[PDB]
Assembly symmetry: D3
Homo-oligomer: 175 residues x 6
């Protein structure tokens, strides 16, 4: 492989540009387009940068200044690229939830925040009854998954986590 | 009370403010409209509020005015009530749907959460995510139980908690 | 069938769910409302569904009930149909507008894309962007043509494709 | 120019802060305000940092530790600043589009994603007929640009790209 | 003019386009609907536009058609006017609310800004933020005063400016 | 404290991941969860990383390679973490506003952009009268704050900034 220093520099500027705005569902494909543009029709060069930037792996010896630049690109871009790829694949999946209990009047309510893999969040208020209905709805859904052969195998994989839920619930009912 | 074609002018104004999505300012924009149509007079405004919020006519009206009044009530009472609801509790959960899908040996759920204000959020969960969400929400019920107000709330929904019992039983047993 | 003031209670409930923007949960929220007004009975629910979805009364009603029924049909049949449309195809394109502007020696277009669900997106393009978008979309038609199902779809719209012909002709010739 | 090391440090913290959240339409102006605040009414200091951070150019010799810090600031912030400036100028222009063909039933449809320079994206579904109508609409718009003297010159600039579109289309029609 | 059940077909179509939130394309979508119902004829379209935009019937109609026409006017004239307003000035401020709260020795305000298009934005300010915003806006009035057009605008609102005077007086004096 | 180099590496990857998407209201809590996971139930390790990453302070001597990694983590993540914490606390507060005056026809209007601490922005158009009404509304709000003991103390703190507003306004009225 014969690369000029200029390629690493141009590639860095282009990657800095695409990652300057929020990662979205087009970002992984936009990154691939940047690599292909840089490779200029040379599959071996494209693959070199994909291995480097997607896998953090250097598939040939580089001269010291280029090796340093590759390490810098890996450090700066590997995770954001993997997150772009993740969003492309499963950006709408739940990633995190927070809840803050507020006690007002007679009533205990929760300010819940739902965050997805793609970073979008949603605020949702629930009182204690809403919370119970939400739990029942989600349990009803696992019970339907359990009838299906795939769902059944998925549930058997976390059988310990399920038995625990029942524990926590038995703990709530006694009190 | 003494009133002019106030009903038609009230109508045109209510049609305008309700032609766009109802928001958190809409109930107050409505009050401002009523105030303006009453020329600021509190007795007349109150007559309109009773009519429009509670559907109650506090005064006999000539046939033509009475016809317009019943029309305003049919057309606006519920949207006004929803605007007040949103002002008060717009961020609370209102509805949830889930569609079960099977992708790559995984049972997954496309959930949609809708609030009182009509905003919705799409959230994907797999079986393990669903279990974690349930654990999270259960923990909130436990948190409420430790707070004197929340504990009273829980005591009011015994039939709700028993329902969670039977679902938890069915799931654990079926595995 | 035996029915109570069910029409008025149905009305108030439909007015409430349609007072906020229609979303992807709205058709299902409607079904739940009908179910609840029918006290769960499938024959009564079906009577309401025929009435409200298809505008068909499957039963003679006293004058007062019949009046309320025609009113529910006029007020809700189309919003119900749109809610079902959105549930099914809410993300599909519905309308596009373009306004041509001239800025700094450039012809530019302010495009607005609107979906079946009513969400809109503003997108600016210059002449070269517009050309690239067209090239992209053309490539999709070529992609569909390589798929046996897509190829059948294309064969159904011969008059559409000829229209593209005449536009392409006019443009190339005029340059 | 007489700068204390403290200025580079304070400037870095302030820039890190403003770039911690998504770039928006106010971000370039917010950056200018940070520079002016740091310059403290000294135009020569403001200009030094603007040349450095907007143009990547150092307009006077710096001592080695400050030169290193300037290079670090350039590497970290030059591209995001240029993107902020770009968004300020043309954030609503199209930047990228992806499409995924889905074959279901009899029908080939495309899940399109529209991304703007500002990073916002929009999902749009199209079937084969929608795609054709979109193409015709966009061609109609170029034809109107062609009547206008500016638009005509813009089109002559990409005359080769246009002739190519016609090619791709002639290729689609034969098949 | 010669017309068919055009009123009912017009009705169903208007009900459909107004069933979703009004957007920036809605007025144009309406015009397209009218065009299509008129079978493209400009005289018939104009009859519908007068009826639907201005509430004016430019033609005597049989009792049944006349009834349908008055119904279309009552149901759609205002939403059409709002759609045109939005097309023209959707981003302009329409309403603002503020609720004053006290948190941690601070007086704070929960402000909500609503535009002509119905979109809203929540914005918190403390006392100093509120002062800065006011200073900003005052500076804009000063900017307009330096522009010959803006200076004319200011001269038209003398009673508005005096109101700012009395408020400014009350505040400074009370401190 | 006995940490393996692997901990710094794992921690960096996890932080890079969470900061790859827009900071939101859950991000500070997500960061705490990452630290606790890394500490693996060891409060002293959690506190070491919290002091390091929240306060930029190293609470024990590290070997040179680990000290270098800690400095790198501080440089990369301290500000974004502080911004996450800020958003958690006051993300909805105003952060910045820009205005651009547009002169069209007889009329001077302003394209205002409102940016919050959380990075969300809102575009709002105002003409000269809207601007005056907005000022009056905000002054009315400060006048109400002045009646309240807390608000009064807040206002006394910026008494100089208030007197200045009055100045700028007196300057506008003379002209």
């Amino acid at each position: 492989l014969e690369l000029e220093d200029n390629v690493f520099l141009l590639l860095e500027g282009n990657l800095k540009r695409i990652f300057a705005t929020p990662i979205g569902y087009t970002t992984f494909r936009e990154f691939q387009n940047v690599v292909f543009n840089c490779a200029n029709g040379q599959q071996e060069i494209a693959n070199f940068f994909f291995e480097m930037l997607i896998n953090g792996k250097l598939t040939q010896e580089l001269a010291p200044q280029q090796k340093q630049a590759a390490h810098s690109l890996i450090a700066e871009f590997m995770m954001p690229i993997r997150v772009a790829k993740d969003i492309h694949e499963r950006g709408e999946f739940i990633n995190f939830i927070t809840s803050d209990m507020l006690t007002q009047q007679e009533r205990c309510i929760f300010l819940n925040r739902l965050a997805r893999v793609d970073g979008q969040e949603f605020l949702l208020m629930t009182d204690v009854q809403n919370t119970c209905h939400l739990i029942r709805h989600l349990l009803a859904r696992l019970l339907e998954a359990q009838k299906n052969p795939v769902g059944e195998k998925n549930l058997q994989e976390i059988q310990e986590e399920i038995t625990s839920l029942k524990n926590h619930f038995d703990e709530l009912t006694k009190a």
